[PDB]
Curated annotation (Swiss-Prot), chain B:
InterPro entries: NAD(P)H-Q_Oxidoreduct_6, NADH_UbQ/plastoQ_OxRdtase_su6, Nuo/plastoQ_OxRdtase_6_NuoJ. Its EC number is 7.1.1.-. One of its GO terms (cellular component) is chloroplast thylakoid membrane. This is NAD(P)H-quinone oxidoreductase subunit 6, chloroplastic. Gene3D superfamilies: NADH-ubiquinone/plastoquinone oxidoreductase chain 6, subunit NuoJ. It comes from the Eukaryota. It catalyses: a plastoquinone + NADH + (n+1) H(+)(in) = a plastoquinol + NAD(+) + n H(+)(out); a plastoquinone + NADPH + (n+1) H(+)(in) = a plastoquinol + NADP(+) + n H(+)(out). It is an enzyme of class 7 (translocase). It is found in: Plastid, Chloroplast thylakoid membrane. PANTHER family: NAD(P)H-QUINONE OXIDOREDUCTASE SUBUNIT 6, CHLOROPLASTIC (PTHR48479:SF1). Belongs to the complex I subunit 6 family. The chain crosses the membrane at residues 10-30, 33-53, 63-83, 105-125, 152-172. NDH shuttles electrons from NAD(P)H:plastoquinone, via FMN and iron-sulfur (Fe-S) centers, to quinones in the photosynthetic chain and possibly in a chloroplast respiratory chain. The immediate electron acceptor for the enzyme in this species is believed to be plastoquinone. Couples the redox reaction to proton translocation, and thus conserves the redox energy in a proton gradient.
From Swiss-Prot, chain C:
GO terms for biological process: ATP synthesis coupled electron transport; photosynthesis, light reaction. The keyword Repeat does not apply. It comes from Spinacia oleracea. NDH is composed of at least 16 different subunits, 5 of which are encoded in the nucleus. This is NAD(P)H-quinone oxidoreductase subunit 2 A, chloroplastic. Its EC number is 7.1.1.-. NDH shuttles electrons from NAD(P)H:plastoquinone, via FMN and iron-sulfur (Fe-S) centers, to quinones in the photosynthetic chain and possibly in a chloroplast respiratory chain. The immediate electron acceptor for the enzyme in this species is believed to be plastoquinone. Couples the redox reaction to proton translocation, and thus conserves the redox energy in a proton gradient. GO terms for molecular function: NADH dehydrogenase (ubiquinone) activity; quinone binding. It catalyses: a plastoquinone + NADH + (n+1) H(+)(in) = a plastoquinol + NAD(+) + n H(+)(out); a plastoquinone + NADPH + (n+1) H(+)(in) = a plastoquinol + NADP(+) + n H(+)(out). Belongs to the complex I subunit 2 family.
Swiss-Prot record, chain E:
NDH is composed of at least 16 different subunits, 5 of which are encoded in the nucleus. Its main location: plastid. It is found in: Plastid, Chloroplast thylakoid membrane. One of its GO terms (biological process) is ATP synthesis coupled electron transport. This is NAD(P)H-quinone oxidoreductase subunit 4L, chloroplastic. Belongs to the complex I subunit 4L family. Keywords: Chloroplast, Membrane, NAD, NADP, Plastid, Plastoquinone, Quinone, Thylakoid, Translocase, Transmembrane, Transmembrane helix, Transport. The keyword Chloroplast applies. Its EC number is 7.1.1.-.
From Swiss-Prot, chain H:
InterPro entries: NAD(P)H_OxRDtase_bac/plastid, NADH_UbQ/plastoQ_OxRdtase_su3, NDAH_ubi_oxred_su3_sf. It is an enzyme of class 7 (translocase). Keywords: Chloroplast, Membrane, NAD, NADP, Plastid, Plastoquinone, Quinone, Thylakoid, Translocase, Transmembrane, Transmembrane helix, Transport. The gene is ndhC. This is NAD(P)H-quinone oxidoreductase subunit 3, chloroplastic. The lineage of its organism: Eukaryota, Viridiplantae, Streptophyta, Embryophyta, Tracheophyta. GO terms for molecular function: NADH dehydrogenase (ubiquinone) activity; quinone binding. It is a multi-pass membrane protein.
Amino acid sequence: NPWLDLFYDGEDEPETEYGSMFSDGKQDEDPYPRDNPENPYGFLKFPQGYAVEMASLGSKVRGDVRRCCCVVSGGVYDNLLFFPAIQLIKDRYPGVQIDIITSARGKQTYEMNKNVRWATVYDLDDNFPDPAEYTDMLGLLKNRYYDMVLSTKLAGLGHAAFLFMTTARDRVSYVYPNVNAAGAGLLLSETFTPDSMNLSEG
Amino acid sequence: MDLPGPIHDFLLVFLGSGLILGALGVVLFTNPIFSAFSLGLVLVCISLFYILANSHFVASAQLLIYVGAINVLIIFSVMFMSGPEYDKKFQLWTVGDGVTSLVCISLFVSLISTILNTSWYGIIWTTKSNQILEQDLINASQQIGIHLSTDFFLPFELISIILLVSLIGAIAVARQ
Amino acid sequence: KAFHLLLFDGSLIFPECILIFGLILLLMIDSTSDQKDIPWLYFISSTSLVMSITALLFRWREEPMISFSGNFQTNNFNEIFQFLILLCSTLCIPLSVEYIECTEMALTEFLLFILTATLGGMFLCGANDLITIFVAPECFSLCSYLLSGYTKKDVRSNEATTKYLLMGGASSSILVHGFSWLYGSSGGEIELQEIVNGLINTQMYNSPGISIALIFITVGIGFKLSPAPSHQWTPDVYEGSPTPVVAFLSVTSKVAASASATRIFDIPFYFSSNEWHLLLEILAILSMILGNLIAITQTSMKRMLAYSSIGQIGYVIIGIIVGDSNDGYASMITYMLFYISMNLGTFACIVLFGLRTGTDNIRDYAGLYTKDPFLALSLALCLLSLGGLPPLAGFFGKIYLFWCGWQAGLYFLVLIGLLTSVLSIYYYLKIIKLLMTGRNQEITPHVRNYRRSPLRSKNSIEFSMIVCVIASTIPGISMNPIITIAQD
Amino acid sequence: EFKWGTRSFIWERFFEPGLSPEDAVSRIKNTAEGLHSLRHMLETMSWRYVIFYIRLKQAYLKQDMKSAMIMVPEGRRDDYSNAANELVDNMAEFDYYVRTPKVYESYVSYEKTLKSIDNLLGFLA
Amino acid sequence: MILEHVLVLSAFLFSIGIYGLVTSRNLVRALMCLELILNAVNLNFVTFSDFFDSRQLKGNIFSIFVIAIAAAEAAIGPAIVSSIYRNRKSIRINQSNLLN
Amino acid sequence: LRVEYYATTAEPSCELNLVRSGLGYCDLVVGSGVPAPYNTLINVHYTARFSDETVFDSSYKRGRPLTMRIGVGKVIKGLDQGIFGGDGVPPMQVGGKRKLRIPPHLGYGPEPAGCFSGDCNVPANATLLYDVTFMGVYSGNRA
Amino acid sequence: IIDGIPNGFGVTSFFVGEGIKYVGGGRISSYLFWYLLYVSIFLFIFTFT
Amino acid sequence: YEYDIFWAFLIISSVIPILAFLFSGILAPISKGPEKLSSYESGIEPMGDAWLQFRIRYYMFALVFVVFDVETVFLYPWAMSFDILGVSVFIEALIFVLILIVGLVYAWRKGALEW
Ligand SMILES: CCC[C@H]1CC[C@H]([C@H]2CC[C@@H](O[C@@H]3O[C@H](CO)[C@@H](O[C@H]4O[C@H](CO)[C@@H](O)[C@H](O)[C@H]4O)[C@H](O)[C@H]3O)CC2)CC1
């Protein structure tokens, strides 16, 4: 583990401030950049000193997410039980857009959900997918530019790589409790080990 | 125009040992104040080396400018750091330092296998005509003044522009 | 005395003396008068950067000469590069005056730093000595450290300045160590066309200490050009610096470093061509491979343009590698001239989009065609020219670069260049794919509240002098080379 | 081969076994030739080049004269030694007149050193 | 004489400075190690001017210019350090990895 | 000793006009151009051989003529006297081809040159032979 | 099988690009160490061997 | 020689404090105690160990001093060669002094030299 992150230098000092703007609060509280109707060229109103491009600062400093991808495995029951997690994402991150990847049966569950933007059908149970369909889904996920991706499917090396190629800042997944999930946590920002080989047993 | 031979070699060895001690103090001290004070020893030893070779003006310029630099460095290290922290005292060792120690040892070995294999005295006897000084220029600082004023005119004004712009940028960036 | 010998030699650097006079006049007026006016600063920066070209074009037909006692060489090769530096500064001043004014910061200091970096870039183009091959890029690198952290308040700019200062102190000291090794094992010679003779005079042209100097010089120069693993300074600095300064450092730094690399690998290092040829081949192959592969996995526009720049530099390196025989240096220019317009247009569109929008993420570029079709069209044209798409400048520039490579027998380099150019379409097409999304649900609120406003603005003129160039130079690629094969 | 002077001086000083007498006599001859060639640099008042040459040739001679005693027959080995000592003394004087430079005294010591080394070659044969 | 030993020391300094440039957890210390590297380069230049350039003194002039450049860097930072400490109240450079 | 093997055909022979300094020279081709100017950079082509006619250096090996500042002692004394002239030697003109016999005292002297890694490029007390060819005065632009 | 070759090319390109992007770290000390390791490698290649 | 006296004088000047320290060590008694070794704080017990952390605007003259030291170092060789050469070096160093004056004016007007 030292050999992975060389020059670690511990964690951040308690007195670090991370600047002034885009430092505290939530996503809906940011006062800058604001509209400048008096500008003849349509340029916004920016704070003194700060660079013009400020929307990228919240992701680095405050860890804001605007588009989230929840790849929920299972049918109607699991996708229904994932509703409090979706509401939690909406409450914690105001203004976020949540997209769901699930099976054909689980996609119909999100008809009665007020928080999901897109619900997409993808055969997650197939361990050997069609190369064209797999590539199309991966490119779609790459082109949505998800800030964070969560996976309730038990992720091996292949699912970890699929989440890795999503270009998401946070890659969070459930992993296999057995030895076959070795190296999956290297490609994921956060890993969860359930108490059994079946997550729906809970 | 030199010291006696054994005295010259003993001074070389002694100042080299002092320089090694100062550099090791620089790269092994947690406190920027302590490592800055070791840097001052390095500066003094290097100025003495310049005096040893033939450079009586470059040594004085090194002393003046680099002493100003280390004084400013100590001031800004006092001002931009936490408490005095005498307890820090030789920061800890990590793997990330151990790999770079090997890399730097390899680099130093590569340099010293060339220095120890090249006959530097052979080059001196080939550049005979480059060592025939003008008899009128007795003062070495006079030669350095003439060759700074005439041979290098464009860098002499470029460094003035560089210093002015560096002063302006230092004032503008560091202002509250 | 006479003050004449320097007076006649001082007229040779008159285009740089104009820049120095404009710099001093701007500084004196800033100090003297309390009030600040944007139009006067615009006027002084422009008239400093359009009188240097006026004087330089008047000096084009003059005889080549080495002035200031083996310190400044004026010939056909360096004049083109000095003109390129002046063109970059002229097309980057409108990019800077609006951007720094909208950040509510002092702008005379920014113009001073840009003018000094231009002055230190023009001197690097012809720098026929070893001291001024060190002092002049320190007139550029120090200003680049003062820039890219001029924001002074964003937490990104401080880290970018830290990385730039530390990595460029790591370089430009390895470079001077190589200069010391080259100066020592030569007989105390520092003029460019006088140390190969000095090497033979001391018979150290096959010494092991010459290989150290070549490697150190190549490393210190490949830091500034940023090919191959000397590239890591580029993206972070490109991601955490204001857009006009990073555009300047994208176009001005590569021109000066390319000129220095051409004048330091051909004039004083022609006897050991078989070594720096291999070094540059590795430096170019790694650059294209690892600058086009990482750019397709980028979520930020400035960082993607950084990987783009470190990919396109490898195409230009082929011009040094082939040599002056099979064109070569005539293919460095006529592509760097292209590259300047390509990058300055694709950065002007980014400048306007960020100023009117307030973002840098690529995902917020969706639906710009519906809001501003002109800006989307211009950015798409710049990016397609960047990808070497047929009717735009990059395609003819790349086939010119590859014709000389094939003519010199470098099949591997041309094949890697073509494969990386194929890889270099997916990006420069991803942004357009975003730009043509009519889905209102995928459109970010950043561009939903977008006001184009009924005024022209300066950057529009500056990139209308550019977008019409990257498309309409495609017939005029016979006028340019006859000015670039004329140099030798 | 060249047998000496082909690497850095400190490496040949400290990390080399040394020279056989048959190479030491050749180094004596080369030192004498270099001393003969040093006259032009002495006349141009280039004291740094001369002092470097004198120190290097001294460092060569302290080994070579000691290790070339074998080639001298027993009937002359004392007298040769005397000549060797004389040469050292002369070079010392030359040293003393290049550092703290003088023109007349350095020239006098230069001629004395040339005569002493010619006597040393006459003894070595 | 053993003048070449100076070269050895210069090389050592360079490597040591290079080492101190990498393991630096304080950017003031990184600036000091930059001064160390430039000092090693200057030692090489001065001893080479002593060796081969007793008349023109090009190495001494280059050493003066390198000292000037080093002082210009030492003026530009710690002003950059001043901006960083005013904005973040921390100096440790390895802890700032936002741009990655 | 450390001679790099370069295969080159020989030049026409001469009778050597020995001078007071010990240099020998002949005018194979008398140049019609400007004579070698003092304190100026000039490009010449040369083929430096040792005694016993073994070539150790050549500007044709590197592919371009060598540029040196002539007349101010930036080469060996024999080459300067052969090219720039003086002491009974007329200066060479542009396009002129001249043979040169540099004695050891006009060359590297009794000290070997280019010594590193167990060998030296030029031995001690070696007479050198140079087939120099004044290509021209240095100019920034080639045709 | 046949269609797996181009899609496999794209997937491997994506994976290698992501791996090279993520393997560094983004810290300045890592930048300097990687910048200096290849200098050491070049020096060992072109001088020692 | 004019510089062996310099080395001998430097050695003697460095030796003198060593002699003073040795003489004090062999002459003066030692009577150390825990109250004696405490840091002096005008009678009262010192609080936290020293440390002041000045403001930046106070210590911004040092960045001017770094540049001005280099400028005054560069001015010396010109003055040494002012008589051998003529008005050429006068014109050369006039720009140096003018740039120095302009930088001083900038530092004065921007408030860098204000306390
Ligand atoms: C076969 C394909 C090529 C290659 C295989 C191996 C692949 C990498 C993937 C991941 C990388 O990760 C390493 O682990 C570290 C965690 O500590 C990272 O450090 C982070 O630390 C923070 C989170 O802990 C983040 O904020 C930082 O951005 C990041 O530095 C470190 O980057 C990296 O060393 C190891 C193997 C790549 C594809």
